[PDB]
Structure formats: structure tokens, C-alpha cells
Amino acid sequence: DPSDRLVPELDTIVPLESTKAYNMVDIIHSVVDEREFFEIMPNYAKNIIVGFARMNGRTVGIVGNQPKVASGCLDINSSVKGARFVRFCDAFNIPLITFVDVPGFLPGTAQEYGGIIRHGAKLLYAFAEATVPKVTVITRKAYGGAYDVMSSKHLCGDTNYAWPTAEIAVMGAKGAVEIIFKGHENVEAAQAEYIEKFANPFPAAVRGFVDDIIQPSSTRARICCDLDVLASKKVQRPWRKHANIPL
Amino acid sequence: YDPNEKTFDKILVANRGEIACRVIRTCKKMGIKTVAIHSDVDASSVHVKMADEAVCVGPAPTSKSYLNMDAIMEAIKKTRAQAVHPGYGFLSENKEFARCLAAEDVVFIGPDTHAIQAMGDKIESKLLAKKAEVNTIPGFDGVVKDAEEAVRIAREIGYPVMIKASAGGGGKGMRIAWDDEETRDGFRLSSQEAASSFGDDRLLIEKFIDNPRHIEIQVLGDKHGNALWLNERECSIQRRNQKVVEEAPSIFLDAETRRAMGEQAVALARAVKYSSAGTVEFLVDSKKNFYFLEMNTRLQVEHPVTECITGLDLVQEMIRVAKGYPLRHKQADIRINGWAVECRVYAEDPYKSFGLPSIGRLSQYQEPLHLPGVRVDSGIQPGSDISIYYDPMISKLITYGSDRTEALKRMADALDNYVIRGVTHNIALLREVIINSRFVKGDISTKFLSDVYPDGFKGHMLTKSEKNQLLAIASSLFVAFQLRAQHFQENSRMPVIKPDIANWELSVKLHDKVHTVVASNNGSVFSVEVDGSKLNVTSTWNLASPLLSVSVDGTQRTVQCLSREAGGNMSIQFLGTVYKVNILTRLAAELNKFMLEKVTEDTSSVLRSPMPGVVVAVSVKPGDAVAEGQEICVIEAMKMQNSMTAGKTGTVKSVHCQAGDTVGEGDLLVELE
Amino acid sequence: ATSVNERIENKRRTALLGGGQRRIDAQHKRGKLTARERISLLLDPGSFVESDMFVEHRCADFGMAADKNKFPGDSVVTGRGRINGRLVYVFSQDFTVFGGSLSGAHAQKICKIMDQAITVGAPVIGLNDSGGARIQEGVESLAGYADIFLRNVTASGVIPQISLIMGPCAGGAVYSPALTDFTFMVKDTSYLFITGPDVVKSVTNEDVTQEELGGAKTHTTMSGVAHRAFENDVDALCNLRDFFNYLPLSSQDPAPVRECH
Ligand SMILES: CCC(=O)SCCNC(=O)CCNC(=O)[C@H](O)C(C)(C)COP(=O)(O)OP(=O)(O)OC[C@H]1O[C@@H](n2cnc3c(N)ncnc32)[C@H](O)[C@@H]1OP(=O)(O)O
Numbered sequence A: 001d002p003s004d005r006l007v008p009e010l011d012t013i014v015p016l017e018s019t020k021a022y023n024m025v026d027i028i029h030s031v032v033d034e035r036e037f038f039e040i041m042p043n044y045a046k047n048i049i050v051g052f053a054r055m056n057g058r059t060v061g062i063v064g065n066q067p068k069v070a071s072g073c074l075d076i077n078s079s080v081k082g083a084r085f086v087r088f089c090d091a092f093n094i095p096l097i098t099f100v101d102v103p104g105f106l107p108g109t110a111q112e113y114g115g116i117i118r119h120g121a122k123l124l125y126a127f128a129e130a131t132v133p134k135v136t137v138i139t140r141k142a143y144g145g146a147y148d149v150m151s152s153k154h155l156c157g158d159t160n161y162a163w164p165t166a167e168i169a170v171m172g173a174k175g176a177v178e179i180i181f182k183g184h185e186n187v188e189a190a191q192a193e194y195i196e197k198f199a200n201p202f203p204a205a206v207r208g209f210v211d212d213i214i215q216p217s218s219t220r221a222r223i224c225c226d227l228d229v230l231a232s233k234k235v236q237r238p239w240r241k242h243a244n245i246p247l
Numbered sequence B: 001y002d003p004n005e006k007t008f009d010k011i012l013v014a015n016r017g018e019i020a021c022r023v024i025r026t027c028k029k030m031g032i033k034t035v036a037i038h039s040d041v042d043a044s045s046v047h048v049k050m051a052d053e054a055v056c057v058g059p060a061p062t063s064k065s066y067l068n069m070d071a072i073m074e075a076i077k078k079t080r081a082q083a084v085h086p087g088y089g090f091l092s093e094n095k096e097f098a099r100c101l102a103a104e105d106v107v108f109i110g111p112d113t114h115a116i117q118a119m120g121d122k123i124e125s126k127l128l129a130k131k132a133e134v135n136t137i138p139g140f141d142g143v144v145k146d147a148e149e150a151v152r153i154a155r156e157i158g159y160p161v162m163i164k165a166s167a168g169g170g171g172k173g174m175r176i177a178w179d180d181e182e183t184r185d186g187f188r189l190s191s192q193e194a195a196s197s198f199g200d201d202r203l204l205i206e207k208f209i210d211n212p213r214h215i216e217i218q219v220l221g222d223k224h225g226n227a228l229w230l231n232e233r234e235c236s237i238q239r240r241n242q243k244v245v246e247e248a249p250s251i252f253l254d255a256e257t258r259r260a261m262g263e264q265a266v267a268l269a270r271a272v273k274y275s276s277a278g279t280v281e282f283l284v285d286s287k288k289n290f291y292f293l294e295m296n297t298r299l300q301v302e303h304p305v306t307e308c309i310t311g312l313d314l315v316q317e318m319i320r321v322a323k324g325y326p327l328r329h330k331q332a333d334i335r336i337n338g339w340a341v342e343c344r345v346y347a348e349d350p351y352k353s354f355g356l357p358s359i360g361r362l363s364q365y366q367e368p369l370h371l372p373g374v375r376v377d378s379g380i381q382p383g384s385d386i387s388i389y390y391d392p393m394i395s396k397l398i399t400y401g402s403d404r405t406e407a408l409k410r411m412a413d414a415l416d417n418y419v420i421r422g423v424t425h426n427i428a429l430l431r432e433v434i435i436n437s438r439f440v441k442g443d444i445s446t447k448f449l450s451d452v453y454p455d456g457f458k459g460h461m462l463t464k465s466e467k468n469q470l471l472a473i474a475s476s477l478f479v480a481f482q483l484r485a486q487h488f489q490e491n492s493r494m495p496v497i498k499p500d501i502a503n504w505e506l507s508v509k510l511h512d513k514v515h516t517v518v519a520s521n522n523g524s525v526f527s528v529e530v531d532g533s534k535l536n537v538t539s540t541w542n543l544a545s546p547l548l549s550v551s552v553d554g555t556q557r558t559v560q561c562l563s564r565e566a567g568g569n570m571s572i573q574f575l576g577t578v579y580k581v582n583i584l585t586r587l588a589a590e591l592n593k594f595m596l597e598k599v600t601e602d603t604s605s606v607l608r609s610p611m612p613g614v615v616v617a618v619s620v621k622p623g624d625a626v627a628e629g630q631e632i633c634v635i636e637a638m639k640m641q642n643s644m645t646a647g648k649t650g651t652v653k654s655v656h657c658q659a660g661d662t663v664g665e666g667d668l669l670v671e672l673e
Numbered sequence C: 001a002t003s004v005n006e007r008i009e010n011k012r013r014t015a016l017l018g019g020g021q022r023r024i025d026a027q028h029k030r031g032k033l034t035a036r037e038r039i040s041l042l043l044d045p046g047s048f049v050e051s052d053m054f055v056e057h058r059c060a061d062f063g064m065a066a067d068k069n070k071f072p073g074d075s076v077v078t079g080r081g082r083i084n085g086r087l088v089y090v091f092s093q094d095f096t097v098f099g100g101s102l103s104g105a106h107a108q109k110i111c112k113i114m115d116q117a118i119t120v121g122a123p124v125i126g127l128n129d130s131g132g133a134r135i136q137e138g139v140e141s142l143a144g145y146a147d148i149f150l151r152n153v154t155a156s157g158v159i160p161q162i163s164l165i166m167g168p169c170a171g172g173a174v175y176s177p178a179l180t181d182f183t184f185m186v187k188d189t190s191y192l193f194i195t196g197p198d199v200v201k202s203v204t205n206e207d208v209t210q211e212e213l214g215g216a217k218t219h220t221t222m223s224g225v226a227h228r229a230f231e232n233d234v235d236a237l238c239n240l241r242d243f244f245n246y247l248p249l250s251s252q253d254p255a256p257v258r259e260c261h
């Protein structure tokens, strides 16, 4: 399986409308070698996908959001499921690849009463603690603290990419517009301007928060090249017996 | 292809799919700016990107996207294109579209309105054909009004009776009555759905031809009163009265009968005063007697197969004729060159009624362009999806050769090297058709699939030698995968020592039989003993390529490995048909005998909604005979609508949840058993 | 004659008063102190040394380039001090300035003191009162949160980190307290929730008040997020000093030993 194999089938996989969903497993299968993917916990916390694949013959751990289930929202179960897999992959020198399409964290009274804060902190911890190479591709959505907990550039990530359909924002257009303009009574034009300016991957690009806005066809090739270079990555951290996981 | 002659500056293509791509390609090769139309869904189709300019026309459904006439008028208004080409279907056979475009300034590539109206209804068509001194199918002039009149007419027109519906298409309102009671009740029922189907409420009772061969004649005309016949074509292998495999020359027809049919077609075209490309369809019995039946006032779908034997670009001729120039070729310039055969690749399952339309998205798609004598017409690319709003057409595969056998061999090779992953196609049925003994001999008819597969398409029945070759290839592939699994990189801390196993003893379960296989490797060559029969399989063993070429005992074969599992299951496409095999090691096969075969409850009835939100709509209703794998009750979310599907197969028990249901992390939903 | 001397005094007087006297009074009517009062109560008398006092936020969108939208210090007070003679680094979030919402400069100051603390080997105490990320600021609010999270994770197991929620903390402001070693809340005035009750009603269609969604009682009796709750701010800070007296000053140090009777 050549490392520079193109995947044109991904050029239109993300629907134009933000209301329709897609299967991230199709993206994973297209990107990886021989379309072979060993999924971990395939029937539990299905709004996140974790598994083992191979890129250019090298074992890679893959974590991604599943827009089919819960629209990709993070919750307690998905947070723990992703966190333990990421920690294992870090502990045994396995590169991580992340596919990001996340609207935020699942709301509700049950999530708060169950301690969603602790488990979201678990996933954020696991991603920030990793010293193995990390590659991230944002497909459609990255809103709020969720965007930060999905291996952003700012958690000492290595390479971050955005598809042309990606969008990075503090929060949704409606809430941002209603909170910026409390008493403007011109929500139409304000929302139009906000979605024209900040509903696209350019605000994160101009600040350098993503390396490039890549075409979806080149994804696999790009990733392979990165995994060739970051194979010798070494970082140094302060000494400690161990750390305090938010468990 | 001389660009010196003045030609239309811009043509709007009012179509979609493979024909739009074809006309855009032939316009680009002729140095003409092209403008394409599309719906919202087909915003990234091949023809849109290949065309110079694109115009969105409407929503997804065809009734508001490509059948929306005023949208086409406004599109041509802004685009100010000189001409419009309708391809086939859609608006190619609508008088009022042609009239309204020709009113202001727009020239139409095709026939005139009066010609379409004349050959638009079967009554006038048959009347003028009789006036055109050509052979016509026996029958009663006019349309019968009462069943008593129909059964009275059936007495003197032959005991076999057939009923057809006036106008329309797609083989609707058509069937056969054999008895007087059959005649009367069939006429009553046909009158019953006459209004529902087309609304003409006009029916035809006449004689049914037994063992018919459908033979097409390609006629070309201009505005200077010149008509030519471009040989013939044979379109007989049909299911649901729709052609799938068709051949440029017909072995049945000799020179004299072909000349007679061509002259009759030219005379009919002159009588109707045709001034473009068209096709005239005849039915031929076993006695070389041809009866006229309808002619198409548009480009034919199977036109490319007759271009290879003649070397003429039909769309180029249509464009030049619409410009006004006369034909540059005489009847002596029309000749048969070689042979040509072409098949239609659909997105349908050939194991159900010889094809049932299916939907999906193409994950992988590769066409066999590199093979000799192969041409592909398709508007499909990797990532395209087969919707429910359009024809399930995927591709048209054309092959040409010096004679029939070479064309058939090239077509079989092309079908073996053609990669489609994401949907289900009918390539198995096509490759069975092209290698059938009757088809090779040529004793075919419109009832080919009805009697060749009386019980329906069952797949490919493979002989003992083919079964041995398939088992050998599967075993060699299994061993090659196992051997590739052992090739790590050097560790220098814990060295890896490869196992010294020399012979692999395998148990291979195929269909309902278990075979014992002994496989040995000698580098790039595998010696495989299947039940005491020795075979030698050699290949490059590239396990990542979708197509694998192997050689079994000198016989070259091309197979695909669609699926593979650690448990031994593997699906391999061999000779165009997908076989499922289970390969285990001998020890694992022995141990498998202790595994209790488990029953499946198969009562998934508690599938929940993902989000604790509310419902937005209900897709289905209790008891709608929907099984599994389709929308039941879609959900709304903070952003994304949840395409909630069904559970187990069967008939939906009940749907209770209504739009706007406040749910606490999940929702009881569709129930099956 | 130069006016560069009265500019410093004017900016100092603006910095101490924060978001204005009216907002100080509004904070007081809710039963809450200010950030500087909290710092004064927490630390030893006359030991607080402030850093980044004059820092101003560098956002220039949605009309925040105006003078009226500029507050020196920018909604956080950071520095170092002594508790019973032992060094500590501290930040307190000012709810008066833009609702304590985090911006580029807010995160910059917090990251600065955290870096100093990990360099010398002293703990960090954070008094949290923040409305989330500054919406008008943009994506660099997310960047500041991510920087703070990265420094929280890096320092874990190196220096102790204490969090005390003093007011309503929402949005992404709930993950830094979760990543620290210990977390305390104040009853009836402190909250912790990712999503507010209004959005929950929009989504879950469940009528829940802020107190019963993210209150101190919820997080100390049925959630497992907070470790203890205190009656008011004064009691909370006295208990915080008492608790801080227990911990080793760094992971390189042994467990503290005090005189015993
Ligand atoms: C990273 C993830 C995110 O972006 S979360 C963003 C949403 N955060 C929220 O707190 C929701 C909106 N805020 C509120 O509902 C309440 O003000 C909160 C902060 C929860 C506490 O309630 P309460 O004690 O009544 O405060 P308040 O209504 O008096 O408001 C005072 C001023 O504070 C401001 N504020 C608060 N948060 C932000 C913020 N993230 N961005 C910008 N401004 C914020 C408010 O604008 C408000 O302004 P004003 O002085 O009332 O005119």
C-alpha cells in the first residue's frame, strides 16, 4: 500500500448542511493501510471511535468523533473510553491520529450529576500528557472546550490540519451573537456577519492554530509524511514519581 | 474534427450523468464553450466540474430540478448559450420545451416538434407506418373500447393476444392475454391503470410475436432532405423490458435483410421528415421477417456501440446538422468495421428479479481503461452516491474487436478488471450473459433471461476445474497473508525467529462442503494439493492492490479480495462472482467441532435515540412492511439530525414516538422480532 | 514637566478599583468580596507582591478598542505571597471586569505565575470566579484555556495545586479546577457547570435551577467533583490557610513536620 495513495472519495464525504451526519469510520477506512481497522469497544460509547490501524506499516492508535451517534458530543463514557486508549498508546510508544468533529459536551442534568467534569478532564489530561507524535485533522466542527480536549495545537500537538469544511469557534453562532449583542435588535445582520467571518477555518489559520487547510484527498499522504518525520520526537518534562489523574 | 467551420458558440446541456459528460467531452474536443446544469445534490458531479460553466437549477427531486422548464429558460437566459442539447430522456421528448425555446432565439439539437408529435403516440405512429409502406405488426386499427369488442377482434387476429398501453415508456401497461376471459379481464385491468399510469386511457390489442429479436436501426437526417442508415444494432438481452447487453452488428441479419431494413427505415424517416439522429426499432422472428415497432426521436442510449464499427461521432453529426450543414457522408461511406459489444453497469442487486435498485456511496471506483479495445462512458467518480431520485446507471462498458470472439474476450477481461466498492452492481449477471453458450452461438431472444434462469439469477455455477482453481487461489492468498504477517523490522533487543513450518494443512469450507488443502511455498510460487489434485499458483502477491492477477497451471486469472477476517472468513470475487470461503488450519478445524452452534434471537426492538433532545419528524407509520436499514423516526439535535434506522428485519410493529418528544438520553422506538 | 508620573498613579487607582465602584457594590450585595480582598485575607499581612498589574487586553473587535472597554489588570489579580512564612503563588479572578471571562491577557498572567511556581517549586492556589471564555475575544480564548490546561497537566505531581470556586464558574472554566489536586466551593454563591440551565432547558427540556444544577451541595453530595464546601468567603479562606499548612511545598520536599506536644 503506497503511502502517497490518494483518497478522492473523501472530497465530498462531509455534507454541506451542518444538520446531516456522516460515518467517521468511512474516513478512517479510506485513510489507513489496506482499509484495516481493529476497533476497541465497538459497541460501547459509540459517539467516539478508538482503534488500532497501520500507516505505512507502522502501528497507529486512532481516536475520532462519530457524528452519527449523539452528533459526536462527548460524555462520560466516551471520555473514559478515549482517555484509557490514549494513555495506553502513549505508554507504549504508539503514534496517535485524531479526527475531530465535535459540537461540544452532551448537556443535561444526568451528565452533571454523574460528574461529567471529572471525565472530560480525564480525556483532556490524557491528550495533554502524551509524548508520542500526535496528528489531528478537523473535518467539520470544533466548538468550545471540546475543541481544546481533542488534541489541539496548544496541548503540545505536532501537526494540526483542517478540511475546507472545518469551522473553529468559541461556541455556536446563535449563542455568540445573542451574547455579544444584548440589545441590538438586528440579530439577522449580526448572525450573517458572524457566520460569514467565524464559521470557517480562517480565524484559526491566521493565528497559526492549524498548520494548513488541506484538501481531503491528500489526507493519508500528508499524515504518512508527518509520521515519517516525528518518528524521532523527544520531549523533556519535570521529574515526578507520578502524576494525579483526575479519576 | 476541423474547427475552421463555424459552429455554435455555446451549448447548454439540459441533462445529467454519463450522457452529459459525453456531450461535454465531444463539445470540448470540437472547441466549443460548454455550460452544464445541475441540481443541488449534483453540485460536485463529474459533468459539472468538467463543463466550462455550471448553473444550479433546483432541489434534489427530478420534478423540480431537471423537469422544471422555467428554470431551464431562466438558466439559458443568463447563460445566453446559442443552443441546447437534451441528451436522452428528461426533456428530449417534450414538444412544449422545444417550442418555447425555439420561440425566442434558441435552436434545438434534435427533431422538429411536428415529427415528435407524429411519432409520439402509437396510434398515429402505426397509421403513418402503414402509410409509409413498411411492415407493421398485425393488429386492429384504432383503440378498442369494450372487452367484448377486444375478444371479438382477437378471434381473427390470432389466438395469442397482447395488450399495450398507448404512449408512455419503460414497458408499462404491457402484458399478454391468451384466453377470451384472459383477454377481457386483462383489458379491464389495463383500462383501470391506464389513467393512473399516463392518463391517455388508450389501449392496443393485437398479435404477440413469439421468439422476437429486437433490432435497432440508427438513422441520421438533416434539413436538406438527406437520410442515412448507420447499419443495425441488436438489443435482445433484456429484463423488465430494459436492455442490459447489446451488440453492434447482428449475426442473424445478412447483407440483404440489413439493406432492406435500412431502406425501409430511411423511407420512414423521409416520410416523417426527420432532420437529426434517431433510431427505428423492429422485431424479427426466426423467419427473418421484421415488423416495425416505434422509433426514438432522440439519441439512443446504446449509440456508442455503433460508433466503433463506423468511426463516426454521432453527437458531432447532430451538432453540425443543427447548425445547418448537410451530411458529408453518403450511403457508400457507411460500412461495418469489426465487431462491438457493450453492457450497462447498474447499481442494482442481480439476485432479486434480475436487478433491484440499490443506494449507497462509492468508496472505491476504478475503470479498466488500460485494457485493449475498451471504452467507458460514465458520469460516476469515487465518492459519488447513488440516490433514489435518478436512474441507477453506473457505467456503459463498450468493447470492440476484429470479430465477435475477440470482442467477447476483451469484454470479459474488462469486466474482470473493473472495481466498484460501496454499492451492489450487476457485473456477475453481465459476465454470465457474455459467456453463455447460447449467447456465444447467438440463439437469443427477448426472453433470454426468462428461460436461461427460470428460477432467477443464482450466481455462477463453477465446474470441478474452476472450483479447484478457486480453492487453490484462496489457500495461496491465506498463506501469503500469514507469511506477510511474520515480516517485522529488525529489533536488535529481542530478535524474531520465523517459524520453520514448510507445509500448511488447511480445511476450506466452500458452500456446504469441506476440502483438505496442502499448501507449500517456494518463494513466489505455491504448490497446492486440493483433495489429491496438484496445482501451481504464481503471482506477485501484492496484498494491497484491489485487483490481483494470478496464474493457475498457466491459466491467467484476475480475482479480487473484498473481505477478510481473522476468523477465517473471506469473500473473493472470482470470474465475476463473489464466493464466501472459510479457511482454517487443520488443528483449528478439528477443535472447531466442539463449538456449539448458537441460535440468534434476532429481536432487536429497543434501539434508542442518541441525544436527550426532542423528535423532529416521523419517517414511517406502524405496519408499513419496512424491515431494516432505513429511516424510522428521525431525531433533531443541537445541530445534527439523527437518521434513526430500524432494528431487526421484518414488518414494523408500531411507531409511537411523535415529533417533539422530551427524552432522557434515549427513546424507545421501532420494534421487530 | 512630564505627565508620565500621574499616568502611573491613575492606572494604579483604576487597577485597584477594578470594574468600578458600582460593580464593587453589586458584588457586595451578592454576599461576595472582591479579588483583592480575597487575596488580602488569604495571605500573610504585608507579604503579597503583585505581578502584571498594568496588563491590558489586546482585542480590537466588536468595539472593544474603545477606552471604556480597557481595564488595566484585565479581570485577574496574580502574584506571590507567604502563608505562615511559606511561599505560594496565587491568582484571583475579578468578576467585575467583563464577568471575569478569560481572554488572552487573563491566560497570559495565569500562565506566567504558574511558570514561576514550577520554576521555583511552590504551590499554586486559584480562587475561581469566572463566566467562561470571552466571546468577543475569539479563538485565542480557547488558546488561553488550552495553555492553562497544559500547564495544569505538566505541573501535576510536581507542585500542589488548590482550587477554590468563589462564584459562578461556567463553560471551559471548569476544567482547570478539575485538573488540580484539590477543589473547594463556597455554599450558596459558587456554581460549577459546563452548560447553563437555559441551554439545558432548550436541549433536555428539563426545568432546573442554577443552584440545583451546579451548586456546592450538588457537587459535594452527589457529584464527586468538589472536596469540601464552606459557609462563606471568610470561613473558606481561613480553612484554606489551615489546609495549606499540611501540604509539602513541593514534591522534592518531605512531608512537613511541626512541633508536637
Ligand atoms: C469556553 C466555553 C464558553 O464559551 S461558555 C460561555 C457562556 N458562559 C456563561 O456564563 C453564560 C452567560 N452568562 C450567564 O448566564 C451569567 O452571567 C453567569 C456568568 C453564568 C452568572 O450569572 P450572574 O451572576 O447573574 O452574572 P450577570 O448576569 O450579572 O452578568 C454580568 C456580566 O458578566 C458578563 N459575562 C459573563 N460571562 C461572559 C462571557 N463568557 N463573555 C462575555 N461576557 C460575560 C456578561 O456579559 C454580563 O454583562 P453585564 O454586566 O450584565 O452587562
Ligand SMILES: Nc1ncnc2c1ncn2[C@@H]1O[C@H](COP(=O)(O)OP(=O)(O)OP(=O)(O)O)[C@@H](O)[C@H]1O
Binding pocket: B137, B162, B164, B168, B169, B170, B171, B172, B174, B207, B208, B209, B212, B214, B238, B241, B281, B283, B293, B294, B296, B446
Ligand atoms: N408487440 C410486441 N411483441 C413482442 N414483444 C414486444 C412487443 N412490443 C414490445 N415488445 C418487447 O418490449 C420491448 C420494448 O417495448 P416497448 O416499445 O413497449 O417499450 P418502451 O418503454 O416504449 O421502449 P422505448 O425505449 O423503445 O421507448 C421490445 O424490445 C420487446 O422485447
Ligand SMILES: *C(=O)CCCC[C@@H]1SC[C@@H]2NC(=O)N[C@@H]21
Binding pocket: A103, A104, A105, A143, A144, A145, A146, A171, A172, B638, B639, C171, C172, C194, C195, C199
Ligand atoms: C452546539 O453544540 C453549539 C455549541 C454550544 C456548546 C455547548 S454549550 C456550552 C457547553 N460547553 C461546550 O463545550 N459544549 C457545550
Ligand SMILES: [Mg+2]
Binding pocket: B294
Ligand atoms: Mg419502446
